[PDB]
Amino acid sequence: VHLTPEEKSAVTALWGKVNVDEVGGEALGRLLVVYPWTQRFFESFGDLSTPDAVMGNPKVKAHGKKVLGAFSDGLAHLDNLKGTFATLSELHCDKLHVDPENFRLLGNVLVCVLAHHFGKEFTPPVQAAYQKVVAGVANALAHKYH
Amino acid sequence: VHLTPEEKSAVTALWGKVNVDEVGGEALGRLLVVYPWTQRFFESFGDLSTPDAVMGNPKVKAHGKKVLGAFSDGLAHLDNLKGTFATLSELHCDKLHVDPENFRLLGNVLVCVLAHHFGKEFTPPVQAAYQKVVAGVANALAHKYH
Amino acid sequence: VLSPADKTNVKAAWGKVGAHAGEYGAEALERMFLSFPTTKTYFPHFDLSHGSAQVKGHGKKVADALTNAVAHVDDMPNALSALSDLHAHKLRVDPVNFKLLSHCLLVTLAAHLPAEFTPAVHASLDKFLASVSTVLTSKYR
Amino acid sequence: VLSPADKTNVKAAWGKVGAHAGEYGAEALERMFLSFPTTKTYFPHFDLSHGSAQVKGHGKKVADALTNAVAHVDDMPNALSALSDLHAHKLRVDPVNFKLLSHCLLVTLAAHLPAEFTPAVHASLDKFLASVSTVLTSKYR
Ligand code: HEM
Ligand code: HEM
Ligand code: HEM
Ligand code: HEM
Ligand SMILES: Cc1c(O)cccc1OCc1cccc(CO)n1
Ligand SMILES: Cc1c(O)cccc1OCc1cccc(CO)n1
Numbered sequence: 001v002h003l004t005p006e007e008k009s010a011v012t013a014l015w016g017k018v019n020v021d022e023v024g025g026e027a028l029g030r031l032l033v034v035y036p037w038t039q040r041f042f043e044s045f046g047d048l049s050t051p052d053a054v055m056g057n058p059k060v061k062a063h064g065k066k067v068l069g070a071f072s073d074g075l076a077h078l079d080n081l082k083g084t085f086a087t088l089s090e091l092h093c094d095k096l097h098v099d100p101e102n103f104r105l106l107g108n109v110l111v112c113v114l115a116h117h118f119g120k121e122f123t124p125p126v127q128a129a130y131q132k133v134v135a136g137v138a139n140a141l142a143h144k145y146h
Numbered sequence: 147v148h149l150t151p152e153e154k155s156a157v158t159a160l161w162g163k164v165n166v167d168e169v170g171g172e173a174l175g176r177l178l179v180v181y182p183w184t185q186r187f188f189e190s191f192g193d194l195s196t197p198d199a200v201m202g203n204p205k206v207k208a209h210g211k212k213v214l215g216a217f218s219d220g221l222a223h224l225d226n227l228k229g230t231f232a233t234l235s236e237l238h239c240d241k242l243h244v245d246p247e248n249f250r251l252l253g254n255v256l257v258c259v260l261a262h263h264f265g266k267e268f269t270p271p272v273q274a275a276y277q278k279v280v281a282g283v284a285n286a287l288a289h290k291y292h
Numbered sequence: 293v294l295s296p297a298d299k300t301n302v303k304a305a306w307g308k309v310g311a312h313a314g315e316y317g318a319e320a321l322e323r324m325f326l327s328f329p330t331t332k333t334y335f336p337h338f339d340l341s342h343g344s345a346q347v348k349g350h351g352k353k354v355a356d357a358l359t360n361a362v363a364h365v366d367d368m369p370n371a372l373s374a375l376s377d378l379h380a381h382k383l384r385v386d387p388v389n390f391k392l393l394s395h396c397l398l399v400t401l402a403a404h405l406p407a408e409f410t411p412a413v414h415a416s417l418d419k420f421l422a423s424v425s426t427v428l429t430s431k432y433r
Numbered sequence: 434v435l436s437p438a439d440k441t442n443v444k445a446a447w448g449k450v451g452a453h454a455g456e457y458g459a460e461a462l463e464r465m466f467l468s469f470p471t472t473k474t475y476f477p478h479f480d481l482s483h484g485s486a487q488v489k490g491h492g493k494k495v496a497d498a499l500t501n502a503v504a505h506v507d508d509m510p511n512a513l514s515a516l517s518d519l520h521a522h523k524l525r526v527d528p529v530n531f532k533l534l535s536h537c538l539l540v541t542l543a544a545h546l547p548a549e550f551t552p553a554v555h556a557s558l559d560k561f562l563a564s565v566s567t568v569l570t571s572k573y574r
Contacts, residue, residue: 037386116543180415262402274327293573432434
C-alpha cells in the first residue's frame with residue numbers, strides 16, 4: 001500500500017496506543033456477532049450463542065490477539081504484504097476456504113473498533129490511512145485466490 | 147492457474163458453437179437490465195430507458211461483440227488470463243473505477259445467456275467448467291485492484 | 293423491493309414451472325454442488341452423488357418453499373419465519389452461498405424455459421431470489 | 434429483515450444523536466470522501482473540500498432522511514420511495530457505495546457514542562443501514 005509520510009506517522013502513533021489484549025478480541029468478536037455466518041469457522045471455540053458469550057469468550061479474545069498481531073506485522077512490512085501474509089493466505093484460502101468478502105468485513109470491523117476506542121482521535125484522515133492498510137491486508141490474505 | 151484438462155476440453159468444445167455476434171450483446175444488455183446501476187457507465191450509449199431499448203440499442207450490441215471478443219481471447223490463453231486482460235484491467239480499474247463485483251455479475255450473466263441458448267446442452271459439468279472461466283476472467287480484470 | 297411488474301413477472305414465470313418444481317430444484321442444487329464444491333460442506337451427512345434420491349427430495353423442498361414465497365411475495369418474513377430460523381439461526385449460511393444457488397436457479401430456468409426467460413423476467417426473478425435470500429439469512433427473531 | 438429488538442436498538446441509538454444529526458451526517462460524508470475517493474465522482478458539482486458548507490448542509494439532509502427512516506422502519510419502501518427514485522432511477526448509484534457510506538456512518542457513531550455502540554446495537558445499526566440501502570438502490574415503481 002501507499003501511505004504519505006504524514007499518514008504513516010499518524011497510523012504508527014495511534015497503533016502504539018492500541019490495547020493489544022482487547023482490541024483484537026473485540027474486532028473478531030464483533031465480526032462473529034454482526035456477521036453470524038462467520039461463526040461456522042470457529043466451531044471449536046465453545047460458546048458463541050449470545051453476543052455477551054462471544055465477547056467474553058477466552059478463545060475469541062486469545063485468537064483475536066493473534067489477528068491483531070498479524071495486522072501489526074502488516075504495518076511493519078507494508079512494502080511486502082503479499083510475502084508477509086503468504087502463510088496465512090494459504091491457510092485462509094486453500095484450507096479454510098474463507099470468502100474474500102469476509103476479509104474486508106473484518107478489516108472494516110477493526111476500523112470500527114479503533115474508532116470506538118479512540119473516539120475523536122480517530123479522525124477522518126486517520127481513518128482514510130487505516131482504510132488503505134486494511135484493504136492491503138485483506139488483499140494480501142486473498143492473494144492465493146488470485 | 148486452474149482448469150483441468152477435462153474442463154478445458156468442455157469449454158473449448160462449447161465455445162466453438164457460440165454466436166460471437168449475438169451472445170456478447172445479450173450478455174451486456176442483460177447486465178444493464180438486471181443490474182440497472184451499470185447503465186451509469188454507459189451514458190453515451192443513448193437510450194437505456196427500458197429493457198426493449200437496451201437490448202435493441204446498436205451501441206450495446208456493438209460493444210457486446212468487443213466484450214465477447216475479449217472472452218474469446220481469454221479462452222485461447224486459459225493459462226495466462228491475467229496477462230491477456232492486463233490492459234483491460236488498467237482501463238476498468240484505474241480509469242473507469244468499476245467495482246470488482248460487477249466483473250463477477252457480468253460473468254454470471256454470460257453463464258445464464260449460455261444456458262438460455264444451449265438449454266439442455268448446457269449441462270452441470272459444462273456450467274461448472276465455465277464458472278471457473280468467468281471467475282478467472284473477473285479476477286484477471288480486477289488485477290490492478292490487487 | 294419488487295415492483296408490481298416484478299411480482300407479475302415472477303408469478304407468471306414460476307407458474308410456468310408447475311409440476312417441474314422438484315426437477316428444477318434438484319437440478320439447481322446439483323449445479324451448485326458441482327460448480328461450487330464448497331457449498332457441499334453445508335450438507336455433510338447428505339448423499340450428494342449424481343442423481344441421488346435425497347438431493348431430488350431436497351430439490352422439491354426448495355422448489356415448494358419458493359412456490360410458497362411467490363404466493364406470499366407481499367409478506368415474505370412471516371411466511372418464511374421457519375426457513376429463516378434454520379438458515380440464519382442454526383446453519384448460519386454465508387449469504388454468498390445464496391447468491392450461488394440463486395444463480396444456479398436462474399441457469400436452470402434459462403435452460404428449461406427459453407421463451408419465458410426474457411431480460412425483464414430475468415431481472416425480476418433475480419430480485420425475487422435476492423429477497424428470499426435476504427429473508428432467510430437474517431435474524432429477525 | 435429487522436427484529437423487534439433491532440428496531441428498539443436503532444431507535445435508542447439514533448435517538449442519542451438528536452441535535453448532532455447534521456454534524457454526524459456531514460462527518461460521515463467526509464469520512465467516505467476521504468477514505469474512498471471514488472465516491473466523489475457522484476458529486477462532481479459539489480464543493481468537496483474539507484469544511485465545505487455544501488457537504489455540511491448535505492450531511493444534514495442525509496441525517497434527516499435516516500431519522501425519517503427510523504420513524505418509518507416498518508414502512509420503508511413507501512416512506513423512502515422519494516429517495517429511491519433519486520438514487521436508483523436518476524443517480525443509478527452502485528450498491529457498493531451504499532456499503533461504504535453505511536460503514537462510515539457506523540464509524541462516526543462509534544466515535545461519538547461509545548456507550549451506545551454495543552455489539553448487538555452495532556449489528557442492528559448495520560442491518561438498518563443495509564435495509565435503507567436496498568430500498569434506495571431498488572427500482573420498484
Ligand atoms: C482479514 C484479516 C484476517 C487476519 C489478519 C487473520 C489472521 C489470522 C491469524 C494470525 C491466524 C492464526 C494462524 C495460526 O496461528 O496458524 C488465523 C487463523 C484462523 N482464521 Fe484468520 N484472519 C483474518 C480473517 C479471517 C476471517 C474473515 C475468517 C473467518 C470468517 C478467518 C478464519 C480463521 C480460522 C477458522 C483460523 C484458525 C482457527 C483455529 O485454528 O481453530 N480468518 N487468522
Ligand atoms: C467482466 C468481464 C468484462 C470484459 C471481458 C470486458 C471487456 C471490455 C472490452 C474489450 C472493452 C473495450 C476496451 C477498448 O476497446 O478500449 C471494454 C470497455 C468498457 N467496459 Fe468492460 N468488460 C468487462 C466488464 C465490465 C463491467 C462489469 C463494466 C461496468 C459495470 C464495464 C465497463 C466498461 C466501459 C464503460 C467500457 C468503455 C465503454 C466506452 O467506450 O464508452 N466492463 N470492456
Ligand atoms: C432460495 C434459497 C433457498 C431456499 C428456498 C431453501 C429452502 C430450504 C428448505 C425448504 C429446506 C428444508 C426445510 C426442512 O427440511 O424442514 C432447507 C434446508 C437446508 N438448506 Fe436451504 N434453501 C435455500 C438456500 C440454501 C443455501 C444457499 C444453502 C447452503 C449453501 C442451504 C442449506 C441448507 C441446509 C444445510 C439445510 C438442512 C438440510 C438437512 O440438514 O437435512 N440452503 N432449505
Ligand atoms: C445510505 C443512505 C443514504 C441516504 C439516507 C441518502 C440521502 C440523501 C438525501 C436526503 C438526498 C437529498 C434529497 C433531496 O434533494 O431532498 C440525497 C442526495 C444525493 N445522494 Fe444520497 N443518500 C444515501 C446514500 C448515497 C450514496 C452512497 C451516494 C453516492 C456514493 C449518494 C449520492 C447522492 C447524490 C449524488 C445526491 C444529489 C446531491 C445533489 O446534487 O443535491 N447517496 N441523498
Ligand atoms: C426488495 C429487496 C431487494 O430488491 C433485494 C434484496 C432484498 C429485498 O427485500 C427483502 C425483503 C425484506 C422484508 C420484506 C420483503 C417483502 O416481503 N422483502
Ligand atoms: C431485512 C433486510 C436485511 O436484513 C438486509 C437488507 C435488506 C433488508 O430488507 C430491505 C427491505 C425491503 C422492503 C421492505 C423493508 C421494510 O420496510 N425492508
